[PDB]
Structures are given as structure tokens and as C-alpha cells.
Amino acid sequence: SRRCPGKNAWPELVGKSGNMAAATVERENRNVHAIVLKEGSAMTKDFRCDRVWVIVNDHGVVTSVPHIT
Known part of the structure; x- marks a missing residue:
């Protein structure tokens, strides 16, 4: 048993603001x-x-991939 609903990773978020990223996750995946x-x-x-961890840099930019973790 390891299959949660909604996307598990948003590689396309890499480079986007931590806010837009987190939002994309909670929006695209209402279950996370x-x-x-x-x-x-x-x-x-x-x-x-x-x-889902939204790792961003000093500028608040998502540097790491935000994926169910």
C-alpha cells in the first residue's frame, strides 16, 4: 500500500516562487x-x-523539486 491521490512531485515548480509552488501543489493536488x-x-x-516540502533560496525561489515528502 503506497499510492496516494494527486501528483506526488512537481518538477515543473523548480524555479518558481515558493508561494506559487506550494499553491500549485495544494491546488493541483487538493489531497496534499x-x-x-x-x-x-x-x-x-x-x-x-x-x-510537500517547498525548498527555496534566499530569494524565495524554489530550488528543489516540491514532491510529496
Whole structure:
């Protein structure tokens, strides 16, 4: 059993504002929730469909792929 509804990764978000990214996740996937954080943020590592990490740079730009994590 490992198949959650909604997209699990938004590679196309790489390069977009952490806000637009998180929004895209919660919007495109109403079954998940995205959180905004910068590169190196002390965040969980486990897997959570309702949780999507939005890693952005000092400019608030999504540098890492926002995927169900």
C-alpha cells in the first residue's frame, strides 16, 4: 500500500516562487499540503502525502523539486 491521490512531485515548480509552488501543489493536488522552507531547513525526512516540502533560496525561489515528502 503506497499510492496516494494527486501528483506526488512537481518538477515543473523548480524555479518558481515558493508561494506559487506550494499553491500549485495544494491546488493541483487538493489531497496534499505544501510547506515553504529554504534550502537546508531542518525539516522531516519521512514520507507524507499531505506534506510537500517547498525548498527555496534566499530569494524565495524554489530550488528543489516540491514532491510529496
